[PDB]
Every structure is written in C-alpha cells, then in structure tokens.
Amino acid sequence: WGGFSVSNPTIQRFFALHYLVPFIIAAMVIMHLMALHIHGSSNPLGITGNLDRIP
Amino acid sequence: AEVTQLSNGIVVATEHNPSAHTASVGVVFGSGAANENPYNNGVSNLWKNIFLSKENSAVAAKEGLALSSNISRDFQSYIVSSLPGSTDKSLDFLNQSFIQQKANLLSSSNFEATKKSVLKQVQDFEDNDHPNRVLEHLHSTAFQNTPLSLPTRGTLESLENLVVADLESFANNHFLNSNAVVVGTGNIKHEDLVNSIESKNLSLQTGTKPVLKKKAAFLGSEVRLRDDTLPKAWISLAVEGEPVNSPNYFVAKLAAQIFGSYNAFEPASRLQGIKLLDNIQEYQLCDNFNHFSLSYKDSGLWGFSTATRNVTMIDDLIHFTLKQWNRLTISVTDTEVERAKSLLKLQLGQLYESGNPVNDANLLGAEVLIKGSKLSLGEAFKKIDAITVKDVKAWAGKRLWDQDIAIAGTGQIEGLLDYMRIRSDMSMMRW
C-alpha cells in the first residue's frame, strides 16, 4: 500500500507495475514458444506427427 | 538429310548417306504406348521383345542381319541392319516377320518365354532405375486418365495378364499400311529400295484405319513414391509443354537449353554459363540435373529432373531452380538466349547427324508419320537464330509464369515441400 490504506501511493505504483508486467509476459511468451519449438505441437490423435508434416 | 518420299499404297522413305558402311531398313508404325489402354498396357513392348526373340534372331544372324526395335509413345519401330549390299535380305526379313513367321513368333513356347523376360525387365526397372522410373511417373500423373499417361514398358499388373490374343488384337488394329512408313537409312538408294519392295505385292489387312480415342490433357498434380531406404531423392517437375510441330517448338527447346543439364562430379560441367549454378554449388544442392522439353502429338512437358543426396536442402534446390524459370518471363538476357542458340544447334546436330542409321530410321519414320516429311537441319537452324528475347518472354509468360505443375519423386523426399509451396514459386511478387 505504501501507507495506511489503498491510497495515492498504491494507485500510482499499480499503474507503474501495470505497464511493466505485460513486457514480462511477452518475455515469458518467448520462453513458451522456445519450449514449444523443440518438440513442436501435438495433434488431436495424441500420437507422433513426424510421419506427415506440412509447412 | 535428303528428303526422298514415294507412295503407291505403301509409303517409302529413305535418306542416303555417302559415308556410312552399313544400311538399315525397317517399318515404323504411327502407334505407341499412347494407343494402348490400362489393361493391354505393355503390349507394344511385348511385340518389341518377341521380334527380338532368340529364335527370330538366329535366323537374321545367319543372313548377316542385326535386329532393332523401339517402343515410344506416339510410335513403334522394327529395324533390320546389314551391309550396303544385303539391303534385299533385309526386306525378305521384314516381309517374313510380318507376313510369314507371324505365327512362329507367337508360339506358346516363344510367347511364354518372352512374357517372362519382359516381366523381369520391367521389374528390375521399377526396382532400380529410379531416374527413369520417376520420369515415367511424371507422365503418369501429368496426363492421368489420358493416353500419354501409360508407361512405354507397361505395368507389371497388366503385363502378367497379357495373352497371345492381345498381341494379335493390337497388331490387327495398328500394324496397318495406313499407319506405317517403310524406312531406309544408311547408304541405300531410293530406287534400289522402292524396286525391291515393288518386287513383292499382296496386302495382308490393307485399307484399314487405326482406332480413335480421348484427347491428351495436362493436369496439375503430383505423385510421391517416398522410400527412405534409398540413398538419394530423385525428382522430376514440369509444366504443360509443346506438342510436336507447334509454333513454339524451338523456343521451348531453347528455353530448356538455357538452364541445361549438370553433373556435379564433372569439372567442365561445373563451369557452364548457367546462372542457376551460382546458387546450387555453394551448399552442393544436388549431384545432377537435366532440363528437358519433351514433345508429343497432342501435348508436351517442359521442366527438369534431378538427383541429390542433400536431403535437408531439397527445398532450396527447388526454390532456386523455379526462381530461375521466373526469369524467362521477366529478365532473360540477350547473351543467355545466344548461348542457348549455339548449344541447341549443337545438340540437334548430334541427334540428327549421328553416324548411326538405326537412329536416323526412327527419326525419319516418326517424323514423316506426323508432318509427312523430315525437318531439314538447315531450316531448324534458321528458326533457332530467328528467336529473340521477346519470343522467349512471351512463351514463358504463357507456359511458365504462374502455371500448374506436375511433380513426381522417389526416395528420401521428406524434404520436398507440399504442392502449393512448390506451386507458389511459379511466379514472383510485384507492385
């Protein structure tokens, strides 16, 4: 809070952090895509997709 | 290339060659694998092989004669070779194999032996001759459910279902005077042959005509024979080409000469003045490639074949090649066209001015069956020189730019991208 209750210091820091987290999420999305990439997507059949891939 | 032709029922065609030492006489019929159906497919190949059977060859050998037979798509040939004087013995043999021994060749003992041989022939080809096998499948898919789709050697399935009757059926419908031209090449004179033929008479199924059918058509498609146990990837890709005797017959052949053929292992081949070579040699995209402009009666195929051990970069091989083709429409250079003119002439020369008479016989027969006469090399050279950059661009804009393709391939083709990706490379983006 930065004080006795949710007040000025809280709203102002919450805006600063609101602006910050979305860039952290973007970075995690890259880590997400990196982990997806080495194994590729799965498919509805739940089995290997290696015998028939399309670009 | 002396054009000598005479008709009196039978159409005789000869071509005298002072420097020769031998002569070749035979008959060329205007029917081939394209005049067959899915079920008797391989019948012509069968006829070719019974005509070359040991029995019928031992006879010709004693007479000092050699036997030749060629089964193509629009025609078939049966040729007899001999010394410049024994030209008459040759005629006695043709007169025999198609009027006398017609039954001796079709005996149960002979037919069964021949059928068993071509059966083993076609099998080894489908098992080991990958580049030709793939080229054959290019025709099969490009012209599916149309005449030009049937392989010349025939299929195993139809071959083992063929019986003596089929040969006769085909023979009665195709080995006819109206669908034939007696050819004579080497050093034999026109009159010398025309009189030796006029000596004998008869007819044997004359005044008949060959059957008719459906018109050949190109269908943008592909056939993939993936085999991961083979060491390479063999592929053929093409667009609808030019039918024999077409306004753009030569422009198409010139266009193919521009990208030519290549063999990675031969030093001089690596030095050719072909732009595409700059792109494929760095990462060695293939062991070899060969462009072609195949021409038939109703249609043709324009494209290329290639073999490679670079199984992880096939997409680059295809990409650079098709990217070069785009150039024919928008930026082929004057000097590329001139280099092709020279090289085209040289190739047509090596084809028509071959020292071998059997080759000339096939060339002569086939050509007169279609245009009535054989194309003079001097007239071909003039048409080739007349070709300009504009001509080439106009042709590619019609036949190449953003047009459907036919693809065929076998072996390690996992790296050959989907149809649409390859298809998209038939054109370039622009404003």
GROMACS .gro file of C-alpha atoms in nm:
model
  486
    1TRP     CA    1   0.000   0.000   0.000
    2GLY     CA    2   0.280   0.243   0.081
    3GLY     CA    3   0.066   0.375   0.364
    4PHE     CA    4  -0.232   0.321   0.594
    5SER     CA    5  -0.474   0.206   0.322
    6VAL     CA    6  -0.516   0.183  -0.054
    7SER     CA    7  -0.438   0.543  -0.148
    8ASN     CA    8  -0.232   0.762  -0.381
    9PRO     CA    9   0.096   0.565  -0.343
   10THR     CA   10  -0.094   0.244  -0.424
   11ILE     CA   11  -0.270   0.358  -0.741
   12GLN     CA   12   0.044   0.522  -0.877
   13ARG     CA   13   0.266   0.217  -0.819
   14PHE     CA   14  -0.008  -0.012  -0.956
   15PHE     CA   15  -0.005   0.189  -1.280
   16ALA     CA   16   0.375   0.164  -1.299
   17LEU     CA   17   0.357  -0.213  -1.244
   18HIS     CA   18   0.062  -0.249  -1.485
   19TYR     CA   19   0.285  -0.107  -1.757
   20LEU     CA   20   0.575  -0.339  -1.655
   21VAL     CA   21   0.419  -0.684  -1.630
   22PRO     CA   22   0.290  -0.705  -1.989
   23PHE     CA   23   0.654  -0.687  -2.108
   24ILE     CA   24   0.745  -0.962  -1.864
   25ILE     CA   25   0.459  -1.167  -2.010
   26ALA     CA   26   0.590  -1.103  -2.360
   27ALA     CA   27   0.928  -1.236  -2.249
   28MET     CA   28   0.769  -1.545  -2.096
   29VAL     CA   29   0.572  -1.597  -2.418
   30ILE     CA   30   0.909  -1.619  -2.594
   31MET     CA   31   1.023  -1.881  -2.343
   32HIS     CA   32   0.685  -2.053  -2.405
   33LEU     CA   33   0.745  -2.054  -2.783
   34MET     CA   34   1.104  -2.175  -2.731
   35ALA     CA   35   0.984  -2.479  -2.540
   36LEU     CA   36   0.709  -2.543  -2.793
   37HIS     CA   37   0.954  -2.530  -3.082
   38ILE     CA   38   1.194  -2.807  -2.984
   39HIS     CA   39   0.911  -3.057  -2.956
   40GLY     CA   40   0.662  -2.899  -3.194
   41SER     CA   41   0.287  -2.908  -3.144
   42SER     CA   42   0.096  -3.222  -3.061
   43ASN     CA   43  -0.218  -3.320  -3.256
   44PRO     CA   44  -0.575  -3.437  -3.186
   45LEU     CA   45  -0.475  -3.801  -3.236
   46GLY     CA   46  -0.226  -3.779  -2.948
   47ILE     CA   47   0.036  -3.971  -3.147
   48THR     CA   48   0.352  -3.876  -3.339
   49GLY     CA   49   0.319  -3.616  -3.612
   50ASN     CA   50   0.662  -3.693  -3.761
   51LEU     CA   51   0.532  -3.905  -4.049
   52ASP     CA   52   0.322  -3.626  -4.203
   53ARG     CA   53   0.409  -3.257  -4.150
   54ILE     CA   54   0.301  -2.956  -4.358
   55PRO     CA   55   0.466  -2.609  -4.352
   56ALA     CA   56   1.926  -3.519  -9.470
   57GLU     CA   57   1.787  -3.583  -9.821
   58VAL     CA   58   1.406  -3.596  -9.818
   59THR     CA   59   1.303  -3.878 -10.055
   60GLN     CA   60   0.942  -4.000 -10.037
   61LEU     CA   61   0.711  -4.204 -10.266
   62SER     CA   62   0.359  -4.353 -10.233
   63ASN     CA   63   0.186  -4.635 -10.426
   64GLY     CA   64  -0.007  -4.790 -10.137
   65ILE     CA   65   0.294  -4.828  -9.909
   66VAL     CA   66   0.477  -4.507  -9.814
   67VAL     CA   67   0.852  -4.547  -9.867
   68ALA     CA   68   1.103  -4.313  -9.704
   69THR     CA   69   1.481  -4.309  -9.744
   70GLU     CA   70   1.782  -4.096  -9.662
   71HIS     CA   71   2.112  -4.158  -9.839
   72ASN     CA   72   2.443  -4.119  -9.654
   73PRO     CA   73   2.763  -4.149  -9.867
   74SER     CA   74   2.983  -4.206  -9.562
   75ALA     CA   75   2.819  -4.498  -9.382
   76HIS     CA   76   2.943  -4.855  -9.442
   77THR     CA   77   2.607  -5.007  -9.337
   78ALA     CA   78   2.237  -4.974  -9.409
   79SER     CA   79   1.918  -5.003  -9.210
   80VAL     CA   80   1.570  -5.087  -9.337
   81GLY     CA   81   1.256  -5.125  -9.131
   82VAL     CA   82   0.897  -5.026  -9.065
   83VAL     CA   83   0.773  -4.751  -8.833
   84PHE     CA   84   0.408  -4.752  -8.719
   85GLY     CA   85   0.227  -4.437  -8.602
   86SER     CA   86   0.114  -4.603  -8.281
   87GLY     CA   87   0.280  -4.642  -7.944
   88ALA     CA   88   0.214  -4.680  -7.572
   89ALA     CA   89  -0.035  -4.393  -7.603
   90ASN     CA   90  -0.256  -4.603  -7.831
   91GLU     CA   91  -0.299  -4.863  -7.559
   92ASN     CA   92  -0.536  -4.886  -7.263
   93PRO     CA   93  -0.469  -4.951  -6.889
   94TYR     CA   94  -0.520  -5.323  -6.941
   95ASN     CA   95  -0.318  -5.415  -7.251
   96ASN     CA   96  -0.051  -5.162  -7.147
   97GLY     CA   97   0.282  -5.320  -7.234
   98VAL     CA   98   0.153  -5.494  -7.544
   99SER     CA   99   0.379  -5.289  -7.772
  100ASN     CA  100   0.681  -5.354  -7.550
  101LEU     CA  101   0.580  -5.720  -7.575
  102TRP     CA  102   0.576  -5.710  -7.956
  103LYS     CA  103   0.920  -5.544  -7.948
  104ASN     CA  104   1.060  -5.827  -7.742
  105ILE     CA  105   0.914  -6.116  -7.942
  106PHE     CA  106   1.058  -5.955  -8.258
  107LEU     CA  107   1.396  -5.973  -8.079
  108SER     CA  108   1.346  -6.329  -7.953
  109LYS     CA  109   1.646  -6.567  -7.985
  110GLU     CA  110   1.465  -6.778  -8.244
  111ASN     CA  111   1.382  -6.490  -8.479
  112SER     CA  112   1.733  -6.351  -8.427
  113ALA     CA  113   1.930  -6.667  -8.506
  114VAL     CA  114   1.756  -6.659  -8.845
  115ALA     CA  115   1.860  -6.298  -8.911
  116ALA     CA  116   2.215  -6.365  -8.787
  117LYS     CA  117   2.287  -6.636  -9.049
  118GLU     CA  118   2.180  -6.385  -9.314
  119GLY     CA  119   2.421  -6.128  -9.166
  120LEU     CA  120   2.145  -5.907  -9.024
  121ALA     CA  121   2.107  -5.729  -8.688
  122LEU     CA  122   1.768  -5.665  -8.523
  123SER     CA  123   1.639  -5.341  -8.364
  124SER     CA  124   1.309  -5.232  -8.208
  125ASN     CA  125   1.200  -4.913  -8.032
  126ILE     CA  126   0.873  -4.863  -7.839
  127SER     CA  127   0.789  -4.496  -7.784
  128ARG     CA  128   0.469  -4.305  -7.701
  129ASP     CA  129   0.348  -4.200  -8.046
  130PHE     CA  130   0.523  -4.471  -8.246
  131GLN     CA  131   0.696  -4.812  -8.271
  132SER     CA  132   0.981  -4.938  -8.483
  133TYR     CA  133   1.123  -5.268  -8.610
  134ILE     CA  134   1.451  -5.224  -8.794
  135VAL     CA  135   1.690  -5.459  -8.975
  136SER     CA  136   2.054  -5.364  -9.031
  137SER     CA  137   2.301  -5.510  -9.281
  138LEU     CA  138   2.587  -5.429  -9.518
  139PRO     CA  139   2.526  -5.178  -9.802
  140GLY     CA  140   2.460  -5.460 -10.050
  141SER     CA  141   2.244  -5.701  -9.848
  142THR     CA  142   1.957  -5.448  -9.844
  143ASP     CA  143   1.741  -5.708 -10.020
  144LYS     CA  144   1.792  -5.970  -9.747
  145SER     CA  145   1.658  -5.708  -9.504
  146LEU     CA  146   1.332  -5.674  -9.697
  147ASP     CA  147   1.297  -6.052  -9.710
  148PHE     CA  148   1.313  -6.046  -9.331
  149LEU     CA  149   1.051  -5.773  -9.280
  150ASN     CA  150   0.833  -5.950  -9.537
  151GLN     CA  151   0.876  -6.266  -9.328
  152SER     CA  152   0.829  -6.138  -8.970
  153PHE     CA  153   0.505  -5.958  -9.058
  154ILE     CA  154   0.352  -6.193  -9.320
  155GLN     CA  155   0.522  -6.535  -9.290
  156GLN     CA  156   0.661  -6.620  -8.942
  157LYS     CA  157   0.377  -6.415  -8.786
  158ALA     CA  158   0.269  -6.737  -8.613
  159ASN     CA  159   0.614  -6.882  -8.533
  160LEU     CA  160   0.685  -6.580  -8.313
  161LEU     CA  161   0.353  -6.624  -8.133
  162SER     CA  162   0.403  -6.992  -8.048
  163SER     CA  163   0.322  -7.092  -7.690
  164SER     CA  164   0.688  -7.174  -7.623
  165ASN     CA  165   0.809  -6.837  -7.754
  166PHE     CA  166   0.535  -6.616  -7.610
  167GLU     CA  167   0.571  -6.761  -7.260
  168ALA     CA  168   0.950  -6.718  -7.269
  169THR     CA  169   0.925  -6.358  -7.392
  170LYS     CA  170   0.648  -6.266  -7.148
  171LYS     CA  171   0.864  -6.398  -6.862
  172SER     CA  172   1.162  -6.188  -6.978
  173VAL     CA  173   0.988  -5.851  -7.018
  174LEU     CA  174   0.821  -5.924  -6.686
  175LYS     CA  175   1.165  -5.947  -6.526
  176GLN     CA  176   1.282  -5.647  -6.731
  177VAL     CA  177   1.008  -5.414  -6.616
  178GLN     CA  178   1.051  -5.534  -6.259
  179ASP     CA  179   1.422  -5.456  -6.241
  180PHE     CA  180   1.346  -5.114  -6.389
  181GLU     CA  181   1.079  -5.035  -6.130
  182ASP     CA  182   1.316  -5.158  -5.857
  183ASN     CA  183   1.641  -4.999  -5.972
  184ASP     CA  184   1.609  -4.736  -6.249
  185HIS     CA  185   1.495  -4.452  -6.023
  186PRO     CA  186   1.550  -4.152  -6.253
  187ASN     CA  187   1.361  -4.306  -6.548
  188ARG     CA  188   1.102  -4.459  -6.315
  189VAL     CA  189   1.031  -4.112  -6.174
  190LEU     CA  190   1.025  -3.954  -6.519
  191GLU     CA  191   0.773  -4.222  -6.612
  192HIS     CA  192   0.554  -4.127  -6.312
  193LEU     CA  193   0.577  -3.762  -6.416
  194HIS     CA  194   0.395  -3.862  -6.737
  195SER     CA  195   0.158  -4.082  -6.538
  196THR     CA  196   0.033  -3.802  -6.313
  197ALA     CA  197   0.070  -3.509  -6.554
  198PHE     CA  198  -0.157  -3.681  -6.807
  199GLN     CA  199  -0.360  -3.911  -6.579
  200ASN     CA  200  -0.670  -4.073  -6.739
  201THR     CA  201  -0.535  -3.963  -7.078
  202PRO     CA  202  -0.324  -4.155  -7.342
  203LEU     CA  203   0.020  -4.011  -7.260
  204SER     CA  204  -0.010  -4.145  -6.903
  205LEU     CA  205   0.070  -4.508  -6.987
  206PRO     CA  206   0.434  -4.610  -6.936
  207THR     CA  207   0.603  -4.733  -7.252
  208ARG     CA  208   0.733  -5.051  -7.086
  209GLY     CA  209   0.386  -5.121  -6.950
  210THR     CA  210   0.296  -5.218  -6.593
  211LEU     CA  211   0.357  -5.549  -6.413
  212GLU     CA  212  -0.013  -5.595  -6.335
  213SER     CA  213  -0.127  -5.561  -6.697
  214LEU     CA  214   0.179  -5.744  -6.831
  215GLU     CA  215   0.110  -6.068  -6.643
  216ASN     CA  216  -0.250  -6.059  -6.769
  217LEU     CA  217  -0.149  -6.033  -7.136
  218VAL     CA  218  -0.205  -6.332  -7.368
  219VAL     CA  219  -0.118  -6.410  -7.732
  220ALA     CA  220  -0.463  -6.288  -7.833
  221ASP     CA  221  -0.385  -5.933  -7.709
  222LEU     CA  222  -0.080  -5.911  -7.940
  223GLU     CA  223  -0.293  -6.009  -8.241
  224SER     CA  224  -0.577  -5.777  -8.137
  225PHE     CA  225  -0.329  -5.489  -8.119
  226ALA     CA  226  -0.147  -5.596  -8.436
  227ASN     CA  227  -0.469  -5.613  -8.641
  228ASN     CA  228  -0.569  -5.268  -8.515
  229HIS     CA  229  -0.227  -5.100  -8.553
  230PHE     CA  230   0.029  -5.278  -8.775
  231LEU     CA  231  -0.154  -5.142  -9.082
  232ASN     CA  232  -0.040  -4.990  -9.410
  233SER     CA  233  -0.218  -4.658  -9.339
  234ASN     CA  234  -0.036  -4.633  -9.004
  235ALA     CA  235   0.303  -4.732  -9.145
  236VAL     CA  236   0.608  -4.599  -9.325
  237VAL     CA  237   0.885  -4.823  -9.453
  238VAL     CA  238   1.215  -4.658  -9.368
  239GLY     CA  239   1.556  -4.697  -9.527
  240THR     CA  240   1.870  -4.533  -9.389
  241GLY     CA  241   2.243  -4.572  -9.441
  242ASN     CA  242   2.382  -4.565  -9.795
  243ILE     CA  243   2.099  -4.737  -9.984
  244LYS     CA  244   1.947  -4.552 -10.281
  245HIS     CA  245   1.578  -4.461 -10.304
  246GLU     CA  246   1.513  -4.652 -10.629
  247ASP     CA  247   1.716  -4.952 -10.513
  248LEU     CA  248   1.472  -4.998 -10.223
  249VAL     CA  249   1.147  -4.890 -10.390
  250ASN     CA  250   1.202  -5.158 -10.658
  251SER     CA  251   1.295  -5.432 -10.411
  252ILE     CA  252   0.967  -5.363 -10.231
  253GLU     CA  253   0.767  -5.326 -10.552
  254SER     CA  254   0.901  -5.672 -10.642
  255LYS     CA  255   0.667  -5.835 -10.389
  256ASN     CA  256   0.298  -5.738 -10.373
  257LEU     CA  257  -0.001  -5.873 -10.174
  258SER     CA  258  -0.158  -5.669  -9.891
  259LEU     CA  259  -0.245  -5.860  -9.568
  260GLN     CA  260  -0.504  -5.645  -9.385
  261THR     CA  261  -0.482  -5.336  -9.608
  262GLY     CA  262  -0.716  -5.039  -9.646
  263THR     CA  263  -0.793  -5.034  -9.272
  264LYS     CA  264  -0.759  -4.749  -9.020
  265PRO     CA  265  -0.642  -4.732  -8.654
  266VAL     CA  266  -0.894  -4.674  -8.374
  267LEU     CA  267  -0.962  -4.328  -8.222
  268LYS     CA  268  -0.998  -4.213  -7.858
  269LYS     CA  269  -0.981  -3.931  -7.596
  270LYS     CA  270  -0.763  -3.616  -7.632
  271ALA     CA  271  -0.448  -3.585  -7.416
  272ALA     CA  272  -0.468  -3.340  -7.126
  273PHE     CA  273  -0.229  -3.194  -6.867
  274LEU     CA  274  -0.348  -3.192  -6.506
  275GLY     CA  275  -0.157  -3.001  -6.238
  276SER     CA  276  -0.081  -3.276  -5.989
  277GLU     CA  277   0.185  -3.489  -5.819
  278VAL     CA  278   0.272  -3.847  -5.725
  279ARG     CA  279   0.511  -3.924  -5.438
  280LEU     CA  280   0.689  -4.260  -5.413
  281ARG     CA  281   0.872  -4.200  -5.083
  282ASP     CA  282   1.131  -4.465  -5.000
  283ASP     CA  283   1.354  -4.379  -4.704
  284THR     CA  284   1.587  -4.675  -4.770
  285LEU     CA  285   1.726  -4.525  -5.095
  286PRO     CA  286   2.041  -4.304  -5.077
  287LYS     CA  287   1.903  -4.017  -5.284
  288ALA     CA  288   1.596  -3.817  -5.376
  289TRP     CA  289   1.504  -3.828  -5.745
  290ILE     CA  290   1.250  -3.579  -5.873
  291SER     CA  291   1.102  -3.453  -6.197
  292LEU     CA  292   0.888  -3.143  -6.220
  293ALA     CA  293   0.726  -2.985  -6.523
  294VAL     CA  294   0.459  -2.765  -6.678
  295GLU     CA  295   0.249  -2.836  -6.989
  296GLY     CA  296   0.492  -2.812  -7.280
  297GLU     CA  297   0.472  -2.802  -7.659
  298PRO     CA  298   0.328  -3.072  -7.888
  299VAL     CA  299   0.549  -3.176  -8.183
  300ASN     CA  300   0.524  -2.923  -8.465
  301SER     CA  301   0.394  -2.626  -8.265
  302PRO     CA  302   0.472  -2.255  -8.326
  303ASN     CA  303   0.685  -2.255  -8.009
  304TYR     CA  304   0.853  -2.592  -8.059
  305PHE     CA  305   1.203  -2.444  -8.083
  306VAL     CA  306   1.154  -2.157  -7.838
  307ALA     CA  307   1.065  -2.421  -7.577
  308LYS     CA  308   1.374  -2.630  -7.655
  309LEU     CA  309   1.590  -2.316  -7.648
  310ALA     CA  310   1.441  -2.222  -7.310
  311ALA     CA  311   1.539  -2.564  -7.173
  312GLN     CA  312   1.895  -2.526  -7.309
  313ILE     CA  313   1.937  -2.203  -7.107
  314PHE     CA  314   1.918  -2.396  -6.777
  315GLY     CA  315   2.065  -2.707  -6.940
  316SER     CA  316   2.195  -3.014  -6.763
  317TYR     CA  317   2.459  -3.052  -6.494
  318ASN     CA  318   2.676  -3.317  -6.333
  319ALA     CA  319   2.836  -3.208  -6.006
  320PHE     CA  320   3.122  -3.455  -6.042
  321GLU     CA  321   3.249  -3.343  -6.386
  322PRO     CA  322   3.480  -3.033  -6.375
  323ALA     CA  323   3.368  -2.880  -6.706
  324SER     CA  324   3.002  -2.920  -6.614
  325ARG     CA  325   3.063  -2.704  -6.305
  326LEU     CA  326   3.191  -2.420  -6.527
  327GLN     CA  327   2.893  -2.382  -6.763
  328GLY     CA  328   2.749  -2.037  -6.820
  329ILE     CA  329   2.428  -2.114  -6.631
  330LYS     CA  330   2.316  -1.861  -6.367
  331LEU     CA  331   2.147  -2.133  -6.158
  332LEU     CA  332   2.489  -2.289  -6.099
  333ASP     CA  333   2.597  -1.997  -5.879
  334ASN     CA  334   2.312  -2.076  -5.638
  335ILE     CA  335   2.335  -2.453  -5.616
  336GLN     CA  336   2.708  -2.518  -5.596
  337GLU     CA  337   2.782  -2.343  -5.264
  338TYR     CA  338   2.597  -2.594  -5.041
  339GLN     CA  339   2.601  -2.854  -5.322
  340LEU     CA  340   2.226  -2.884  -5.361
  341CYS     CA  341   2.234  -3.183  -5.599
  342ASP     CA  342   2.451  -3.441  -5.775
  343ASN     CA  343   2.293  -3.366  -6.113
  344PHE     CA  344   2.007  -3.210  -6.304
  345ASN     CA  345   1.876  -3.206  -6.659
  346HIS     CA  346   1.625  -2.977  -6.820
  347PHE     CA  347   1.403  -3.101  -7.100
  348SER     CA  348   1.132  -3.005  -7.346
  349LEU     CA  349   0.952  -3.328  -7.429
  350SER     CA  350   0.722  -3.309  -7.731
  351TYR     CA  351   0.443  -3.542  -7.839
  352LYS     CA  352   0.146  -3.539  -8.080
  353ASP     CA  353  -0.112  -3.378  -7.851
  354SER     CA  354   0.097  -3.224  -7.574
  355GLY     CA  355   0.438  -3.194  -7.415
  356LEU     CA  356   0.626  -3.149  -7.090
  357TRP     CA  357   0.869  -2.872  -7.004
  358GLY     CA  358   1.073  -2.894  -6.686
  359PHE     CA  359   1.365  -3.078  -6.532
  360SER     CA  360   1.486  -3.387  -6.348
  361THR     CA  361   1.738  -3.402  -6.065
  362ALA     CA  362   1.908  -3.632  -5.812
  363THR     CA  363   2.050  -3.538  -5.476
  364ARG     CA  364   2.200  -3.666  -5.152
  365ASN     CA  365   2.135  -3.328  -4.992
  366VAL     CA  366   1.812  -3.444  -4.831
  367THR     CA  367   1.789  -3.150  -4.589
  368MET     CA  368   1.808  -2.876  -4.852
  369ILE     CA  369   1.578  -3.003  -5.127
  370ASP     CA  370   1.354  -2.701  -5.071
  371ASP     CA  371   1.645  -2.473  -5.170
  372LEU     CA  372   1.718  -2.685  -5.478
  373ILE     CA  373   1.359  -2.648  -5.598
  374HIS     CA  374   1.334  -2.286  -5.489
  375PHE     CA  375   1.640  -2.166  -5.685
  376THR     CA  376   1.551  -2.365  -5.996
  377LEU     CA  377   1.192  -2.238  -6.020
  378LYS     CA  378   1.318  -1.892  -5.928
  379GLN     CA  379   1.544  -1.902  -6.235
  380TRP     CA  380   1.247  -2.009  -6.453
  381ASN     CA  381   1.057  -1.697  -6.345
  382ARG     CA  382   1.343  -1.508  -6.510
  383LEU     CA  383   1.245  -1.632  -6.858
  384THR     CA  384   0.930  -1.422  -6.830
  385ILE     CA  385   1.075  -1.106  -6.683
  386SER     CA  386   1.452  -1.088  -6.730
  387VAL     CA  387   1.624  -1.347  -6.952
  388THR     CA  388   1.933  -1.179  -7.101
  389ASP     CA  389   2.030  -1.149  -7.463
  390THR     CA  390   2.352  -1.344  -7.410
  391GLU     CA  391   2.167  -1.627  -7.232
  392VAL     CA  392   1.948  -1.659  -7.541
  393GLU     CA  393   2.253  -1.654  -7.771
  394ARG     CA  394   2.437  -1.921  -7.569
  395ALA     CA  395   2.126  -2.139  -7.592
  396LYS     CA  396   2.100  -2.091  -7.970
  397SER     CA  397   2.454  -2.221  -8.018
  398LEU     CA  398   2.416  -2.511  -7.775
  399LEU     CA  399   2.074  -2.601  -7.916
  400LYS     CA  400   2.216  -2.623  -8.270
  401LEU     CA  401   2.499  -2.844  -8.147
  402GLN     CA  402   2.253  -3.080  -7.975
  403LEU     CA  403   2.013  -3.104  -8.271
  404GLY     CA  404   2.320  -3.174  -8.480
  405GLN     CA  405   2.436  -3.458  -8.254
  406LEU     CA  406   2.085  -3.605  -8.273
  407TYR     CA  407   2.011  -3.587  -8.645
  408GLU     CA  408   2.371  -3.604  -8.769
  409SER     CA  409   2.451  -3.916  -8.573
  410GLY     CA  410   2.666  -4.169  -8.756
  411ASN     CA  411   2.416  -4.445  -8.671
  412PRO     CA  412   2.148  -4.542  -8.932
  413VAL     CA  413   1.906  -4.708  -8.687
  414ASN     CA  414   1.873  -4.371  -8.511
  415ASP     CA  415   1.801  -4.196  -8.841
  416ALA     CA  416   1.545  -4.464  -8.925
  417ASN     CA  417   1.350  -4.393  -8.605
  418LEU     CA  418   1.384  -4.019  -8.659
  419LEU     CA  419   1.278  -4.046  -9.023
  420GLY     CA  420   0.983  -4.278  -8.971
  421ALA     CA  421   0.843  -4.090  -8.673
  422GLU     CA  422   0.873  -3.753  -8.845
  423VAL     CA  423   0.704  -3.847  -9.176
  424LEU     CA  424   0.421  -4.019  -8.989
  425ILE     CA  425   0.333  -3.681  -8.836
  426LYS     CA  426   0.433  -3.399  -9.073
  427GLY     CA  427   0.469  -3.615  -9.383
  428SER     CA  428   0.834  -3.512  -9.415
  429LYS     CA  429   1.151  -3.486  -9.208
  430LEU     CA  430   1.263  -3.148  -9.074
  431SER     CA  431   1.576  -3.025  -9.252
  432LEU     CA  432   1.852  -2.924  -9.010
  433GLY     CA  433   1.924  -2.610  -9.211
  434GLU     CA  434   1.567  -2.487  -9.164
  435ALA     CA  435   1.581  -2.566  -8.793
  436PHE     CA  436   1.899  -2.360  -8.751
  437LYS     CA  437   1.732  -2.062  -8.922
  438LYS     CA  438   1.428  -2.077  -8.694
  439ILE     CA  439   1.658  -2.103  -8.390
  440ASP     CA  440   1.856  -1.795  -8.496
  441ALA     CA  441   1.531  -1.605  -8.555
  442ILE     CA  442   1.441  -1.642  -8.186
  443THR     CA  443   1.460  -1.325  -7.977
  444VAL     CA  444   1.439  -1.234  -7.609
  445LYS     CA  445   1.081  -1.112  -7.664
  446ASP     CA  446   0.990  -1.451  -7.811
  447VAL     CA  447   1.122  -1.627  -7.502
  448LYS     CA  448   0.945  -1.393  -7.259
  449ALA     CA  449   0.616  -1.432  -7.445
  450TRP     CA  450   0.645  -1.810  -7.433
  451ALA     CA  451   0.731  -1.825  -7.060
  452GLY     CA  452   0.451  -1.583  -6.972
  453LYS     CA  453   0.212  -1.834  -7.130
  454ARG     CA  454   0.359  -2.172  -7.036
  455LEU     CA  455   0.564  -2.098  -6.723
  456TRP     CA  456   0.453  -1.792  -6.526
  457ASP     CA  457   0.205  -1.888  -6.254
  458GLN     CA  458   0.103  -2.216  -6.419
  459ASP     CA  459   0.016  -2.557  -6.273
  460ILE     CA  460   0.294  -2.812  -6.241
  461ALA     CA  461   0.325  -3.189  -6.235
  462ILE     CA  462   0.557  -3.343  -5.976
  463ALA     CA  463   0.694  -3.693  -5.927
  464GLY     CA  464   0.963  -3.823  -5.695
  465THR     CA  465   1.104  -4.122  -5.512
  466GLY     CA  466   1.348  -4.193  -5.233
  467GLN     CA  467   1.430  -3.959  -4.946
  468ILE     CA  468   1.175  -3.696  -5.042
  469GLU     CA  469   1.065  -3.592  -4.694
  470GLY     CA  470   1.227  -3.257  -4.764
  471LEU     CA  471   1.022  -3.194  -5.080
  472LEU     CA  472   0.761  -2.943  -4.960
  473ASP     CA  473   0.387  -2.964  -5.035
  474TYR     CA  474   0.244  -2.896  -5.382
  475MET     CA  475   0.127  -2.543  -5.302
  476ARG     CA  476   0.469  -2.430  -5.181
  477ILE     CA  477   0.637  -2.553  -5.499
  478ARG     CA  478   0.345  -2.412  -5.700
  479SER     CA  479   0.382  -2.065  -5.543
  480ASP     CA  480   0.736  -2.042  -5.681
  481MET     CA  481   0.597  -2.030  -6.038
  482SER     CA  482   0.577  -1.651  -6.007
  483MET     CA  483   0.719  -1.352  -5.821
  484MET     CA  484   0.556  -1.076  -5.616
  485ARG     CA  485   0.547  -0.723  -5.757
  486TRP     CA  486   0.391  -0.378  -5.743
   0.00000   0.00000   0.00000
